[PDB]
Symmetry: C3
Amino acid sequence: HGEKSQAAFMRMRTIHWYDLSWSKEKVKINETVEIKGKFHVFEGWPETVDEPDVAFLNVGMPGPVFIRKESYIGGQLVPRSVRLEIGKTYDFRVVLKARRPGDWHVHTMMNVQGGGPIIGPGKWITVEGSMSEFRNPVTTLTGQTVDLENYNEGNTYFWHAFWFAIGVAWIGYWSRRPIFIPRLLMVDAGRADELVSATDRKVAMGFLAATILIVVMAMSSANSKYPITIPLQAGTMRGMKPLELPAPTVSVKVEDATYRVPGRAMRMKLTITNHGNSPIRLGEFYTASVRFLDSDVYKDTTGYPEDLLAEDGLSVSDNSPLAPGETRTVDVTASDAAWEVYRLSDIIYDPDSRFAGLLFFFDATGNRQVVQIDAPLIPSFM
Amino acid sequence: HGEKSQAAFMRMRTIHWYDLSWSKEKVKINETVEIKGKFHVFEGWPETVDEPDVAFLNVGMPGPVFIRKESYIGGQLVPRSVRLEIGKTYDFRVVLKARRPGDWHVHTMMNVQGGGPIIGPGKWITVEGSMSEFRNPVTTLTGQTVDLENYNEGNTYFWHAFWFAIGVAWIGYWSRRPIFIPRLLMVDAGRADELVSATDRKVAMGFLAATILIVVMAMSSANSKYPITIPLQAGTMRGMKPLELPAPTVSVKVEDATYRVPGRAMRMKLTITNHGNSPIRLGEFYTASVRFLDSDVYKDTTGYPEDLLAEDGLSVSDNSPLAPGETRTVDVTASDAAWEVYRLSDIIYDPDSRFAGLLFFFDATGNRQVVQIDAPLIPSFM
Amino acid sequence: HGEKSQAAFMRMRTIHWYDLSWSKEKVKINETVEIKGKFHVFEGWPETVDEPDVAFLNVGMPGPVFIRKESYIGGQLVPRSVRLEIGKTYDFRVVLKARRPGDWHVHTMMNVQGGGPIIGPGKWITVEGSMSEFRNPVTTLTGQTVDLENYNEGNTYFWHAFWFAIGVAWIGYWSRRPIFIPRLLMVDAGRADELVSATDRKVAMGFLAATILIVVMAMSSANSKYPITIPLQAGTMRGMKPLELPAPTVSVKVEDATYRVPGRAMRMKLTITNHGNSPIRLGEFYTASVRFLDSDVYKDTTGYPEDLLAEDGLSVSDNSPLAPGETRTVDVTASDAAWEVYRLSDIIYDPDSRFAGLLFFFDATGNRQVVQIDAPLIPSFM
Ligand SMILES: CCCCCCC/C=C/CCCCCCCC(=O)OC[C@H](COP(=O)(O)OCCN)OC(=O)CCCCCCCCCCCCCCC
Ligand SMILES: CCCCCCC/C=C/CCCCCCCC(=O)OC[C@H](COP(=O)(O)OCCN)OC(=O)CCCCCCCCCCCCCCC
Ligand SMILES: CCCCCCC/C=C/CCCCCCCC(=O)OC[C@H](COP(=O)(O)OCCN)OC(=O)CCCCCCCCCCCCCCC
Ligand SMILES: CCCCCCC/C=C/CCCCCCCC(=O)OC[C@H](COP(=O)(O)OCCN)OC(=O)CCCCCCCCCCCCCCC
Ligand SMILES: CCCCCCC/C=C/CCCCCCCC(=O)OC[C@H](COP(=O)(O)OCCN)OC(=O)CCCCCCCCCCCCCCC
Ligand SMILES: CCCCCCC/C=C/CCCCCCCC(=O)OC[C@H](COP(=O)(O)OCCN)OC(=O)CCCCCCCCCCCCCCC
Ligand SMILES: CCCCCCC/C=C\CCCCCCCC(=O)OC[C@H](COP(=O)(O)OCCN)OC(=O)CCCCCCCCCCCCCCC
Ligand SMILES: CCCCCCC/C=C\CCCCCCCC(=O)OC[C@H](COP(=O)(O)OCCN)OC(=O)CCCCCCCCCCCCCCC
Ligand SMILES: CCCCCCC/C=C\CCCCCCCC(=O)OC[C@H](COP(=O)(O)OCCN)OC(=O)CCCCCCCCCCCCCCC
Ligand SMILES: [Cu+2]
Ligand SMILES: [Cu+2]
Ligand SMILES: [Cu+2]
Ligand SMILES: [Cu+2]
Ligand SMILES: [Cu+2]
Ligand SMILES: [Cu+2]
């Protein structure tokens, strides 16, 4: 939730999430779900979004209904912010543990500093069980195993209640006497010195000394109880390993790209050159989490969110085997209610009417090439 | 105009504009002139100029004597700011349309954010005709063809005059009575409440209600008249395609570079190694829009501004065919009044006495290699 | 001095200084000492240190006990700040001239803007002689040879004394009369106009006119005496040539890296793959200026500061010739008091417990390969 309201061109021109898998659709409490996939950083990064020099891989959900057990970018655990390079592709994996029952829309997201949220496709996952069964065991380097759900709760309650009680006692010591009107009149009359006695001064001295001594003793006792402590671990982790992918033996030029403004579709003229890899055929156009597929060339079998999957939303004028070398100019039409449901038609309000997306080409043997396209998008009103 | 006053080293060390062409020297009104060429970004970019992450290709002229019909960087239209990389070469093309008659010095420039203006060579172009004949037709996506010279002029005049008249009427309603002295005396005397009557309150209420209602009705009518509107299109366009140029089979090392301070020339010792490409010969040294040529090796036939063209300003101790492999140390002398006219001799006031420029080598067949040189420049006073 | 107090991980993860040489250990006054070596910029640059876009090569010493005659980065003199790239290796050379007698700990350092100091290994150098024998001759472009120790000293003294005397005379002219109490009483009584006479006004006018005229005449005389002047030369020098080094035919993966917190050592599990270059053997681990060596494989003969040299501080479970192709998992133990002396054990207070260092592999013929390792460092308390 939160993507439909984001500018259409910003969603089109930031990060592209390609083949994704979810290990389970329905999980029990304390069971783990794995979300893997690839994300590509668009070369034409918008200028109002800072470069992903400081980026964090996040899980979009209405709260800690899951707990993120681990997250890996390129096989490396990423508990901190990371640095990503423009134009590179990265594998990502996220292992989550179920905490609260219910149906949850879970998304993979990249939070970018100086940019904001970049939400990926969301999937509905059902958690069955009771929240009281959730456990979060962690073993420390000191040899102690604790449960993070209730660890250190009683100590915090005790100390906060103790200090609150001390403050309440300090206020109530003075609250046993007339408070506001008689004291104000006495101060106005010049009898302020009569409002504080020697016993009050001794009580204040005792309160101050007891507070300081208790703080010192509590710090000493806490140090004795936990002689081994480390500061909070923070920093930006550089040197993320990107994917070394086969360059596309397929070249695609966008002649024109238009959308009818009333409109639930997008149309584009494309010149495609096959540089080998056998006769190929376009099977899918990915724009903003929406996948328009050509049923005759490719069929999704990964449980891609159906609200974002158009099984026959790709209409190519001529989708015949493009013999290696053939340069065919084709008119592709990407049509689906998701265009209007995911407010991609709101590119009419955007201060930049340019789109970007991914095209997937398959040969007879099923090998897939990914081609990256970007162009300006012209609205049609006649 | 405006380059002679810019620091000599800043002009030497930012952008180099090489082979340029102008389609016409004399044009009529509404006729188009094309300026094409190449620009190279110097690797040793000055630190006080921000990197050209946000750069705009501009035309330097005393105003809209021309209108910039289009501009292309690497074959791509660039109506917005673009991103350029240090050390890369780009083709550029600018098509301008003549608007005002007269002789105009036209320059191609790169405005760089956090840096300032980078002016290129200027050429004198004559426009013959009358300004009243200039037309700027534009066809909109709604099917309307308009002339940008006078489009929406009458509407703006009408609305501004209407609101100015309303304000004048509001002031003049109160201006029919004594204004300053009697009213001031009455306010001082305590008779302020007598200065505003019930009729005045009713008039003020009517003015407020009429203003609000007129604004609302005008907005509704404007929306009805123009139901299709888009916001201003802005942004920085990345992914500019640079030139893939042959690396210079010629290696040049600058041993020493000196200039006499009184002085109208510059001298340099150079070690040149030919790595193939047949016997070569130096034909031209480009510094800051100034081209020093060796008449025996090369002759300009592009109409390069004569104030910046020194046909025999390159004197090479030995400019004989440098057999592939020969490593000759030569003393080159670049001499021309342009050195003093374009204030390149003002490098003596610069906080950085280092120069950069381009050397052009030609073989027997006429093939040209471009070598890029940079060194510190030492003034000579004895 | 000043490195032991710097965070251990910051010292481990910034710049690595490898093979270094000092021309002399004991020098006389006016004699020169050359310090050469290589420095590598770590790929995982810490986020709190700005990238070395503006870096200066500096000499760490308690003052001008030496004078830095020259400094070269990649064979190019670097009197100004320079730009360095992450992940590149550079040669550096520094020629210093002895000025003051005594024993001096001299370090090579890289000052990085927005980062702070990066100190390298320090060496003790003895200077014998008298400071009065030190000379700093410099020949100017005007044909004058001067000594920078005493040049322009007398002129500065004369002008400062002259202006101080003028100010003292101005104060003392008024100081001959009663100063504070009688004048205050007269001003309070309304007799302020009697405290300044016409002669005082004439004296003030003469002082003002003489000051302005003297300033103008002094400027004119200084211009006449030195008709050739240049501004201060400043700027950041880009285009530093890095080393083109053989990629390591040796691959090393860090399985685990741990240190006992009481502790004077560090332990690591490593998987090493030989990709040719004959049977190899680990001979040295460099962490933070500390070099742990395996005496049986390599011996230092460069006079590396002994406080930072552990001749037998590298213990490899199996350090037998790793036949090209062999993938052996070995347990290496780097032990030395320098770990505690140079406060590398203070990584326990660091907000980032990750280390980086260099491994040196030698074959039978003595050829050396450098492998770069980085991992998180886990403290052991049991
Ligand atoms: C829950 C209260 C709201 C917020 C409290 C915030 C800070 C505390 C303020 C007052 C503390 C001192 C009590 C008054 C002097 C406590 C005090 O003096 O009590 C005797 C009073 C005074 O004697 P008197 O002049 O002969 O009688 C006048 C009132 N009948 O008599 C009483 O019968 C008791 C009345 C006082 C009861 C108020 C207690 C509520 C405060 C404790 C709340 C603790 C929880 C805090 C978080 C919400
Ligand atoms: C690092 C330097 C210290 C900071 C400088 C200021 C220090 C001030 C000193 C007092 C100067 C004022 C004159 C008072 C003369 C001595 C003095 O302390 O008198 C009591 C004064 C009231 O002043 P007075 O009676 O008119 O003074 C005349 C002689 N008694 O109250 C206080 O000082 C505050 C309340 C009583 C203090 C008891 C200790 C509790 C507070 C400290 C914590 C102790 C427990 C430590 C935990 C381990
Ligand atoms: C061009 C004027 C300069 C700038 C104007 C700026 C804002 C407007 C100020 C005054 C408007 C109300 C007029 C006075 C009450 C208009 C008004 O009350 O006119 C009757 C006056 C007053 O009657 P009275 O007391 O019996 O006579 C005294 C003056 N003789 O009599 C007149 O004979 C007319 C004199 C007033 C003429 C001034 C008009 C100029 C202002 C309009 C300019 C519009 C263009 C604006 C942009 C420049
Ligand atoms: C979103 C919330 C609204 C903002 C809150 C403030 C609103 C204020 C309300 C009035 C409170 C003061 C008491 C007045 C009582 C009602 C009232 O409006 O009285 C007239 C008052 C003068 O006060 P009064 O006579 O002593 O009031 C006693 C009873 N009449 O003048 C005004 O309110 C201003 C001039 C007359 C207003 C006429 C409408 C023109 C202005 C609004 C635009 C209407 C056209 C819309 C275009 C589509
Ligand atoms: C070294 C002094 C410290 C700093 C000086 C800073 C600025 C100068 C202040 C005073 C200058 C005017 C002198 C007084 C009027 C100089 C002056 O009027 O001298 C005659 C006085 C006054 O005559 P009187 O009323 O009959 O006698 C009263 C004092 N006996 O008599 C004297 O016997 C001389 C006393 C004055 C000597 C003070 C001189 C010190 C200042 C010069 C220092 C220069 C070095 C500067 C850097 C440190
Ligand atoms: C660029 C524009 C200049 C700045 C504008 C202000 C200039 C001010 C002028 C004076 C106006 C006040 C009326 C005084 C009338 C003329 C005048 O200068 O009178 C003397 C006034 C005192 O005023 P007054 O006697 O009541 O004036 C009545 C007629 N004399 O003192 C001063 O002006 C200051 C002290 C005397 C000046 C002598 C010259 C020394 C200062 C300047 C440097 C000269 C040497 C140059 C070196 C090459
Ligand atoms: C959450 C836990 C709540 C803690 C509650 C603590 C109690 C707080 C205040 C008690 C007020 C009694 C005032 C009696 C003066 C009532 C009073 O003033 O009585 C006259 C005495 C006469 O004493 P004397 O013998 O003639 O002279 C002194 C030596 N003999 O004067 C005084 O000066 C008596 C001073 C006594 C002050 C006691 C207050 C100390 C409170 C510290 C509390 C510590 C916090 C808890 C620790 C875990
Ligand atoms: C650029 C175009 C210029 C537009 C010029 C607009 C004219 C402006 C002001 C007229 C002043 C007349 C004042 C008469 C009070 C003169 C006045 O006060 O007369 C006494 C009346 C008595 O009226 P009554 O009948 O006894 O009671 C009300 C119901 N019957 O009192 C009032 O309260 C009369 C109020 C009348 C106010 C009229 C002003 C409205 C002006 C709106 C202009 C709209 C803008 C143009 C639209 C395109
Ligand atoms: C470090 C070097 C130190 C320099 C010391 C300079 C001496 C400073 C002040 C002298 C005070 C004498 C005051 C006499 C008034 C004492 C005074 O006021 O005497 C009455 C005269 C009467 O003169 P008169 O003839 O009747 O009228 C004028 C034409 N004839 O009035 C005046 O107005 C006299 C004005 C004389 C002022 C002289 C002060 C000039 C000082 C400039 C110094 C230059 C700096 C050094 C250059 C290298
Ligand atoms: Cu959602
Ligand atoms: Cu992409
Ligand atoms: Cu010009
Ligand atoms: Cu260049
Ligand atoms: Cu030291
Ligand atoms: Cu390194």
